[PDB]
């Protein structure tokens, strides 16, 4: 019976110059998980374990600096949530002396103002991602037939770790929630033209406006996580003798796919609670709309 939105962490933004995803939940960067996976490789790769020193000094700095960067946007985040709470509750909307179509544009102005803060405060941090990746690519080189027992042992464990995520359960959740949302936007198009109840219908139209944004993010991760699952499984189905140059390309293959897997799984569980909370608002509003 929830009527207001407490959590608005479903907002994310990708940088335009270089394409990186910034989520409000830690670690904020999918690359940080890729950095966290190299510690498992370094412990099992060879006697060289110098990454344990860079993981505690350089990797945590990026994570800690990014968490601060997201924390600077509290003023933007609280002001965005304020516009979201107003346009959702008619009891909180009838207090102000402004119209819905008048302050519905103020929402978009602040919605993008907050997303700009998530990127600008992390723009200085994205440079360290390319600086750490080069450092990882530099420290790993220290032969024409390097071993591969560790590479394939990771793929065998990833497939078991992939089954921990309910992908088939998340996929069916979309097609039923998406069609139910399309049936909701269809009903208001025929009631708003025959029934004169503008104040309540505006909240249902606004809630559906944000629902499409979260469905987009919930879908966008589902295929990208699926693409990682489908590729990591493809590397297993498709040696024991590899050069050291391809070993850097081989570790980046499993590293980029698994870091995307864990980062997308972090967004999906968050966007799941966001979608259910949005549906509870539009479900209990139909009881008041009728």
């Amino acid at each position: 019976s929830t009527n207001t939105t407490d959590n608005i962490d479903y907002f994310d933004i990708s940088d335009e110059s270089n394409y990186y995803l910034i989520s409000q939940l830690r670690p904020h960067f999918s690359n940080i998980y890729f950095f966290d996976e190299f510690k498992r490789y370094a412990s099992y790769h060879t006697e060289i374990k110098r990454y344990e020193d860079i993981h505690k000094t350089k990797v945590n700095s990026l994570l800690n600096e990014a968490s601060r960067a997201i924390g600077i946007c509290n003023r933007a985040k609280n002001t965005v949530k304020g516009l979201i709470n107003i346009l959702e509750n008619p009891q909180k909307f009838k207090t102000q002396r402004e119209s819905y179509d008048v302050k519905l544009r103020q929402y978009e102005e602040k919605k993008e103002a907050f997303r700009g803060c998530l990127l600008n405060k992390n723009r200085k941090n994205l440079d360290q991602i390319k600086k750490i990746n080069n450092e990882i690519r530099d420290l790993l080189e220290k032969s024409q037939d390097c071993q591969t027992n560790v590479y394939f042992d990771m793929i065998k464990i990833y497939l078991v770790d992939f089954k921990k995520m309910p992908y088939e359960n998340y996929d069916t959740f979309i097609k039923q929630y998406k069609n139910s949302y399309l049936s909701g936007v269809d009903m208001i198009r025929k009631i708003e033209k025959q029934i004169d109840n503008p104040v309540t219908i505006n909240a249902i139209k606004f809630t559906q406006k944000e629902m499409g944004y979260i469905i987009d993010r919930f879908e966008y991760h589902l295929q990208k996580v699926k693409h990682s699952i489908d590729q990591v499984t493809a590397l297993s189905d498709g040696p024991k003798q590899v050069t050291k140059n391809r070993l850097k390309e081989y570790y980046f293959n499993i590293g980029n796919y698994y870091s995307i897997f864990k980062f997308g799984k972090d967004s999906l569980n968050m966007l799941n609670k966001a979608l259910i909370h949005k549906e509870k608002i539009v479900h209990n509003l139909l009881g008041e709309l009728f």
Partner: antibody
Amino acid sequence: VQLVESGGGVVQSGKSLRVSCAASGFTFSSYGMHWVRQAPGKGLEWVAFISYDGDNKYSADSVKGRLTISRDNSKNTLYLQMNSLRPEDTAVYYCAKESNYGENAFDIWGQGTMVTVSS
Amino acid sequence: ALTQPRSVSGSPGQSVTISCTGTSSDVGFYNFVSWYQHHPGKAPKLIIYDVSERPSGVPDRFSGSKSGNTASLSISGLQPEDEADYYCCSYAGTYTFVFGSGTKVTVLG
């Protein structure tokens, strides 16, 4: 939303005690869980943290390498096990829940169970 | 352990404040500090998350503020139900948290 925890009354020194926090009224498998203990004299302090899956488990530096934390999503319980106890850590262990408003706050807390260390 | 006063005193209808200053990397670096109200036997409930905002059930009397490495909680219009122990909590970093020492807010009877 209710967080019920259960802990033993007395524990011998250097022995292990397991603490279980049963969650209900909300989706336990989607929220993070925290442990907080409070000595009879001092105030409460942060102890550890688990993600919703259990893949990320972290603890404070004071109890690092001494306290093991885990969760059972099917049984909907939060588990904390402390090994090699010392008479200085006898405290009321509270079961904290990750906040709905954000991951940097604690929304719902547990009642707290008293654990005494006397051999 | 963050440092806050040992005891603060206020009369019914008065306003008091509580300082919270730990380290330079704990409080003043993250803007993720928080405050919790602990009754003698009851479970501690969250009053103020982040720097200045409050959950839905928290009255208008509690105020959140922060400057530098010093966070501050403010309670205006004290009522006899406000007598409790108050702890500040800041995000330490690397998935860790730190709690304050605690203040025994006592309404003057």
